[PDB]
Amino acid sequence: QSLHIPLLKGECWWGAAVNRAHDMPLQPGAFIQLNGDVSGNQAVPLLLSSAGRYVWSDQPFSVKREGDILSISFTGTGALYTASGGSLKDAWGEAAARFFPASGRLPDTSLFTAPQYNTWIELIYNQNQEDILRYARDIVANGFPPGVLMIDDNWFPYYGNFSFRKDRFPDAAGMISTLHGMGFKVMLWVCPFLSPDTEAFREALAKRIVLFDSKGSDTLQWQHAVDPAIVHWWNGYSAVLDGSNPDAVTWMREKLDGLQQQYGIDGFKFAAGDAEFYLGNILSREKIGANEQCERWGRIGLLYPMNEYRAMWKNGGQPLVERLRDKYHTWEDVRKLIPHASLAGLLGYSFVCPDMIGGGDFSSFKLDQELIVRSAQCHALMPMMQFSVAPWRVLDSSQLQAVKNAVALRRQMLPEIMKYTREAAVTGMPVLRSMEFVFPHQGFERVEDQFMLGDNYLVAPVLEKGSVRKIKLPKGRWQEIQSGKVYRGGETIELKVTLNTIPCFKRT
Amino acid sequence: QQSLHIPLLKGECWWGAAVNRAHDMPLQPGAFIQLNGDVSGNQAVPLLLSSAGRYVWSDQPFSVKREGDILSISFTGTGALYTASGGSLKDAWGEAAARFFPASGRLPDTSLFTAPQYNTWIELIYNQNQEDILRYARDIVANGFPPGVLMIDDNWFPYYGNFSFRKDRFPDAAGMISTLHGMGFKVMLWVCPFLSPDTEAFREALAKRIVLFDSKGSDTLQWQHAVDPAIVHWWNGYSAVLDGSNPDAVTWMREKLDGLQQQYGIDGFKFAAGDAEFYLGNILSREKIGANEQCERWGRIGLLYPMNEYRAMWKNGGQPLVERLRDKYHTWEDVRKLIPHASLAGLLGYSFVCPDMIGGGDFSSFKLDQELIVRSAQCHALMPMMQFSVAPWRVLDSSQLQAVKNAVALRRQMLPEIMKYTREAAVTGMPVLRSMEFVFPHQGFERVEDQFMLGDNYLVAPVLEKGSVRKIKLPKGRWQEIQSGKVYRGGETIELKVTLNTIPCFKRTT
C-alpha cells in the first residue's frame, strides 16, 4: 500500500528516526527505510509537518521525497492526517493523543535530579570494583554532584550470565553499599545476547526462549526448530532472546530481579535490541517482525523505572529514558544533540538524554578540550546530563571550571526542568522543544542550534569555535539570565562569548 | 583419486583406520570407513594391517571398503601396499611402525600409569567446584583407594578460551591444588581450542588472527584478507576455534597453559575436542592444511606437556601422548569394546591407551548396573592405564566395592610388569596391550576380542558377560592361573567357574 503526498508551500517534514534528524527537514532525494532498521537509535512510524499535517502507521514504512512529493510505502496500512490548528505542535499533539498517549508515569527521578555518570569511556572493557569506586570517589572529590552511576559493558563473566565477575569484583554487594552511601544510585548494562557455548546458552536453548534458525525454510515452524539463531553484533557472535516469547520475559525478569535482590541494583541500561539484529533466517514464537522485537525489548523497561535505551521501536509516551546514540568526539556530532533531542521529543520520547559528554564512541578514545566544554554546556539544560570521560583527567583547570559552571547552571535551572519533566509524564509534551514547536511560522523551521526549555527559556549553546555567537530571538522581550540584559525580540543578535558562556534567555 | 584394489589372501583378516570402529573388524564384506574429515569420535591413522603381514599406508587420509574379498582404498594423496616377509600381524605392525610412525623414545608422565586415574566428570559433571573436588579427593583416600592423577574436567573456567579458575566456584584454586598435592595427587585440567565467540578472549584471538576464518564459500578469498571467524557447532554449543596451522595459535596456547602451571601448579592437561569434523566447511587456515591435519596439530601440543591425554587424534603414532578411548555408554556392549579398541589403538601407534572411564564416560547415562561397573573396573585393571570417574563407594554395595578394590590391588601387584612393557613401548613402539593374534599368529585367534596379552607372558580374560562360566581360548603352551596356581595345557578352550571377584589371568610357563 502506497501514498503520495505533495508538500504544501513552504512545508517542512520531520520524523521516522531520531538518528536522521540532522538530515531534516526532509530534502529532495531524501530516503528513510524503517522496515528492519531503527538507524542505530529510536524510530517511530510517524511523520510531522510544519503545517500541522502528520502521517502514521502502526507498522514500518519507507519514505522518499522526490521533488516536492513524499512517496510512502507501508508494510501495513497508513494515512495522512491534518490538525486544524496548522502548526507542528498541533500535529504532535493530535498524533500523540491518537497513537502514543502519555502513560502518566515518569522514569526514576534520580535520573533527572543530578547528572548521570557512565563508566564506559573511562574504564571501557576493564570494569572492576577498585576502578569504579575510584571514579565515584573522584566525582565527589572534584565537587561534582553524586547521581546515577552506570556500570557499562563487561561487569559480568560472559553474555547471559547476570552476576558480577568475582575476579574483578571481590565484594560487589559491598561496592554497591559504598556507592549508595556516597549518594549514587547504580545501574548495570544488560543485553539480550547469550554467549552461545555456555551454561546460560544451553539453559535458554532448553527452555526454548531463544530465537531459532529457520534454515531458510519456507515451512519450518518455531515449535519444531532445534538450532538457535546466531547473530553478529559489535562484540561478536551470540544467541539472542526471542522477545515475542513470554518465557523470555520471565527469564529476563528472574535475572534482573535477582541482581536487585542480591546486590541492591537500582536499575538497568538496556543495550542492543536493534531491529537489524532480528533480520534473516529467524523463527520467533509469535511470528513478529524485526521492529517489534526491538519494541518488546523496550517494554522490559516498563518494569524497571530506572532504565535507559538506545535502540527503540515505538513506545512513545512511555516512562523509558531514551539516550541518543554513541556520539563521536567531533564538532559535527555535538551539533546533532539539539535536533536529535528535539525530534525524539516529537516522536514521543520526552525523557531524552544526549549520549555522553565529550563523546560516547570508545574507539575515538588528541582530545579537544573546548569541544568537551561545549558538549557539557549543551547537555546542561537538556532533560538529562550524562558524563563518562572524566573531566578532571582530560581538562585543564579553567576548562574544568567551565564544566563545573555548567553543572551549577543545571542546578539553578532544575526546578524548571522538573516542572516540565513531570508535566511530560502527564501530557507527553516535550521538555526540550524545537524553536518551531514553540514559535510556529516565525522563521524557525531550520534553527537547530537553539531550543526551548519548556515555554519560557531559550537556550543557545555555543557550538563552534569563535568569540561570536548569533541568536535568533522570536518576537517578545528576552532577558539573558546571567547578564540580565533585556533584548527586543524579532531579530538576530550577536553575543561576545567565552569558554564559559552558556547563552540562555527568559521570556518576559 | 588414486586407489588400490586388493584381493584378500586365504584366511586373511584386516584391521586399521579408526580406533572407535575396532568392534566391526576384522573388516567384513560391505565395510566402509571414510577417514577424510572423520576420526570417528576418537583416534584415526591412515594405516591398514593384515594377519598375513600385509599393510597399507598413506601420509594422507583415505576411504576403505571391502566388497566381497576385495579391499579397496581410495587416497586423497598417494598410498601403497607392502608385505612384511615374516607373514604375521606383528610383522606388518613392526615394519609399518618403523617406516611410518617410529617410536619417539619418550614416555608420558609416569604418574599416569603408576596409580589409577580419577576424573571428576561423571561425579560432578558441569558443577566443577573447589569444595566438591576436594571432597571427592578426600573420599578416594578415606575409602582406601590410592592417590593418583586427578583430572578436573569441563567447566572449571568462566567460558571457553578463558584459562582461569572461575572465582565463584573456586575461591582459592592455588590452595586447592596445594592441598591435592599434599594428599599425593597430581592435577590435570580439561582444555580445548574453542572460544566463546562474543568474549574478550575471542576478540583478542580475532585481533591476533589466530582463529580459523570463514571463507564465505568463496574459492578466491585468501586467509590474509578474511575478516570473520569460522563458527563451529559442537556438543557444548557454537564457538570460534583456534587455527592449529597458525604458529601464533601455538604461542597463544603455550602462554595459556604455561600460565596455569606457573600460577596454580597444574601438572598437566586433558586436551579435549580437536576432531577433524570440526574443521570442515567454509574455513580458511593460515597454512592451507586439511581437517585431519588440524586434529593432528592439536595433538602435537601435548608433546610439550608430558602429562596429557587426548580422545581425538589423527596420526601421531609413536608419540608420548596418552590416547583415551572415547566416552563409553553404561552398557555391556560398550564394556566389550574396551579390549578390541585398545588393541587396535596399539597397532596404530598408540601404546599409551587408557580405556575411558570405569562404568561409563557418557554423562547422559547418569538402574546403574553394579555388576557392569565391577567388570568395567576389572577390565581396566591390567590395561596400560586405569581410570575412574563415577564414585565406586557411592554407587556400589559392599561386596561390589570390595571387588573393585581387589581389582586395584591386582593392578598394584602387576604394576612392575605393566611398567616394564610401558617403558619398552616408548623405545620400540611395541604395544603394552597386545591382541591374541599379535602374540599368537595363525592359531585361530583372529576374532578373539575378549582376551588380551599384557606383554608376552600374561593372558588376561576379563569377565565381560553375566553368568558363572567364562570360556578361555589358550594358545599352545602351558598357562598358570596366577591366583590358583593351576597349570592348564593350551591348544584348547577351557571353561572357568567365576564369581564377581574373578579376574582370569594366566602366566605363560611354556
Ligand SMILES: OC[C@H]1O[C@@H](O)[C@H](O)[C@@H](O)[C@H]1O
Ligand atoms: O550501536 C552501539 C554500538 O555502537 C558502536 O559504534 C560502538 O563502537 C559500540 O561500543 C556500541 O555502543
Ligand SMILES: OC[C@H]1O[C@@H](O)[C@H](O)[C@@H](O)[C@H]1O
Ligand atoms: O565426542 C565427545 C563428546 O561425546 C559425547 O557423547 C558426550 O556427551 C560429550 O560429553 C563429549 O565427551
Ligand SMILES: [Cl-]
Ligand atoms: Cl553491530
Ligand SMILES: [Cl-]
Ligand atoms: Cl559434537
